[PDB]
Structure formats: C-alpha cells, structure tokens
Structure 1
Amino acid sequence: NYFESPFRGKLLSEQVSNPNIRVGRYSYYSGYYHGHSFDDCARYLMPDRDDVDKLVIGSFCSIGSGAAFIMAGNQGHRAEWASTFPFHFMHEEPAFAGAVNGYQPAGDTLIGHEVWIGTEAMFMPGVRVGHGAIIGSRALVTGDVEPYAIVGGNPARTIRKRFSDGDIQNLLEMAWWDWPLADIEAAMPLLCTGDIPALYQHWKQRQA
C-alpha cells in the first residue's frame, strides 16, 4: 500500500507524476483504502500527449480515498452516430479501416481552491468545481459546481451553499488561498471560525 495509514495522506505535489496533472500547494490525497498513488486517480489521462484535457487542482484541497476523475473526453465513442462502437480504434480488424476517429476533447477538468472531495466521488469529463465547494462521498459530478456549494448524489446535486451569498462574495474577494503563508498564519485564528465578516476586516486592515 502506497499509504501507511488511513489517518495520514500524502501531498499531491509529492506523488503526482503525469505531466498533465497540475496540483497546487498543500493540496493532498489520502487513499490508503485504495492503495494507489494519486496518479491513477486521473483515469485515461495520457502523460505522453499535450493536446489533451488536463486535470487541474487548486490549492488546499483535501481529496478523499478512491476519488476519480474520468478523462479523455468521449474516448472515441459518439452517442449521436449510428453506432457507439470505436471502430477506428480496433486497428487490428481491416474491415474497420476507413473508420473515422470519433474522439473529441471535453476541456480541462478544473478543481478550484479549498475543495473537499469525499471518498469515492467521481467527476465526469470537463466539469469545473468552484472554490470551497464540498463534494459529497460517492457523489457523481455531471457538471459545474458553484463556489461554496455542497453537492452529493448520483447524479450530484447542490444540497446548499456553505455561506451567505454576501459572505461568499467576500471570501472570493480576499482569496486567502493566494495569501503569503505568513499572512495565513496571521489570520489563522480567524480561519478557524465561521466569521467571514471578521476575517474580511482583518484582511482589509492588514492590506494597509
């Protein structure tokens, strides 16, 4: 097992290896219950091409065991053609030669900052998860998620948002995830409360 205990995961920056996975600071993944390194979480991601959708993960994300990001767009299957069979890809059968390539990209999968993904959640290709969002365990994400939204279910739904629209707006304005570590340690006492307005002030103050 890549992990020594269920209670201690390892940084993304120290286990990612596919060049198409760009991870941010402090972000981590604890997958003892699935034994494999974060790399294998990005399914169907080619480390060999640069013409493909990439998995981008913000900073301070906490990724739960077994999470999975389905990549490679449609994988060559086209529901809108008469046949969803990847003829073009079965290069070993001649009959299927003239077969055209039905593959088509879906765009980078983006995971914002401070996103908490529950064990075994699965993201479809091309979705974009907003900052602070919380992805429920086993939630199957079929689309974009709003910042600070709480989703869950198959298909994933917004259960509610973490803070007030206004609070959210403030949180987005000060983007503490881009703050110099020194300021993070400074505002620390306030990061451990739900007093966004307090935190906002402390911010505005120091900015001076």
Structure 2
Amino acid sequence: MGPNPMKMYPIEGNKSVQFIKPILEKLENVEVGEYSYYDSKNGETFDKQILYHYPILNDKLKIGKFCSIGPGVTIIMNGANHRMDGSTYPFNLFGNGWEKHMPKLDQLPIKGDTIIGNDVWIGKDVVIMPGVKIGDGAIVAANSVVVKDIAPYMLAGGNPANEIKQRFDQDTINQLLDIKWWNWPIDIINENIDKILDNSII
C-alpha cells in the first residue's frame, strides 16, 4: 500500500499537506526522512520555515522519519544570534567605515546541530531554537518554545518548554526505541500500523 513519499503533495487536492523531504531535499545541510509531513498554515512550503540557516556556518538540520509538523512551526538555525561577548550591536551592517568590523567566524555563536527524531509530533505555531535535539517519538505542545533538549517519548511544552511527562512506562519506551519501526521495510509497516498505533508491536 501507500502514498508516494516523493510527491510534494501526496494528497490529490490537499495542497496544504506536504511531505517535507523532497522540498528540503534540495537544501544543503538539510537531511530529511521520508513520510514526515508539514501542514501548511497559509500554503507556504516548509523550506520557507527554516530561518537564519547559512551553509557557511556548517550547522545541520536532521529530521527523522514519520514526523508530524503543524502550521507555524519555525526552526531557528544558528544565523539568528547577535555576537554577545561584547556589545551585541551589529556595527558592520551599516558600512561607511563600520563595514570593517564583521565577526570572524569563531567569535560567532555555535550552539550545535538541530536534531528532530522519528515519529515526532510538533504542534502548531512551534518554535525550535538553535541547538536543540528532539527525542524519538516526542510530543511538543502547541505554541511551545523549545530551547532545551527533549528526551524521547517525552511530552514537552511551554515558553520556555519543559518536559511535562513521559507518554509511556519507561520500559515501553526502552523497547520502542529498541525496535525502531520507522526503519522497518515499508512492506512490513503496512501490516503493523495498528500494532504501531496501539503501541503493541512491542
């Protein structure tokens, strides 16, 4: 069974639901997993939703397999930060002599790579701040502002967002992360969705 993961619009008609991989599959230092979708807030494509993400800074966007991303979700790659070891005022923007004062790489922020795992639900209007890695099978509550790391199968929410609670007994998770179905052959999953939906495949 199934829909095609390489169609930008895998639902005849619906032009809001997008599998992100293909779209982002042009982008550098963006690696995406099949079947993970974005749902458009205004019809914009997800690519426009990555911001301050410049190849020359070498930070990476990893998004896993079978992820649900909702409208308004913006991911904030490193480019955003003002230098902060001194004045944070970007003298070099305005030229006329000041142009000589650009930050030499190293004195730029580096907060790391940004990792979204598999089977991750990110609510609507969510903001992932630079650096953070989000755990396999995690849920991020709507209008959240993720600045910390989110453990697998944790419920995180807030601004700043906090680990509200595990979604399962720590043993189910441990198993779940052990079995790692999102990786299974497509042929296999199509015959295990309900056991994957009902959390039985364990």
Q: Partner residue of 1:132? A: 137
Structure 1, residues 150-185: CA drift from partner, whole Å, max 9, x if none?
Answer: 111111011111111011100011001111112212
CA RMSD across the alignment? 2.2
Structure with the greater alpha carbon radius of gyration: 1
Does 2:70 match 1:64?
A: yes
Instruction: Work out the percentage of aligned pairs sharing the same amino acid.
Output: 36
**How far apart in 2 are the matches of 1:147 and 1:25?**
20
**How far apart in 2 are the matches of 1:99 and 1:122?**
28
Post-superposition offset of 1:5 = 4.8
Q: Partner residue of 1:34? A: 42
Q: Partner residue of 2:119? A: 114
Runs of 4+ in 1 over 4 A off after TM superposition: 2-6
- 1:1-208 residue pairs with structure 2 within 5 A? 5=14, 8-16=16-24, 17-31=26-40, 33-46=41-54, 49=55, 51-73=57-79, 75=81, 77-81=82-86, 83-87=87-91, 89-90=92-93, 92-95=95-98, 97-98=100-101, 100-101=103-104, 102-195=107-200, 199-200=201-202
49-58 or 177-186: bigger deviation: 49-58
* Contact residue 133 and residue 150 of structure 1 kept, 8 A: yes
Post-superposition offset of 1:93 = 2.8
Post-superposition offset of 1:20 = 2.4
**How far apart in 2 are the matches of 1:113 and 1:168?**
13
TM-score normalised to structure 2 length: 0.84
**How many residue pairs align between the two structures?**
189
Q: Partner residue of 2:4? A: none
Post-superposition offset of 1:186 = 2.4
Post-superposition offset of 1:92 = 1.6
Amino acid in structure 2 at the alignment position of 1:175 = K
TM-score normalised to structure 1 length: 0.82
Post-superposition offset of 1:99 = 5.2
Amino acid in structure 2 at the alignment position of 1:97 = K
Q: Are residues 84 and 133 of structure 1, via their aligned partners in 2, closer, same or farther at CA, if it must alter by over 3 Å? A: same
Q: Are residues 24 and 71 of structure 1, via their aligned partners in 2, closer, same or farther at CA, if it must alter by over 3 Å? A: same
**How far apart in 1 are the matches of 2:169 and 2:31?**
30
Post-superposition offset of 1:40 = 1.1
* Contact residue 121 and residue 138 of structure 1 kept, 8 A: yes
Give unpaired runs (5+ residues) of structure 1: 201-208
**How far apart in 2 are the matches of 1:104 and 1:90?**
18
**How far apart in 2 are the matches of 1:152 and 1:138?**
8
